[PDB]
Amino acid sequence: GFGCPGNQLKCNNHCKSISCRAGYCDAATLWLRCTCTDCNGKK
Helix, strand or coil: CCCCCCCCHHHHHHHHHHCCCEEECCCCCCCCCCEEECCCCCC
């Protein structure tokens, strides 16, 4: 991911730093990855 496990805010900040709104750690992967959800960069 990019912070997890034990770093869900790091994914949001990382998603906000990259170009998104807020992400989350694959809750289906025991929270490890750092996915990005909702982004403001389309058309």
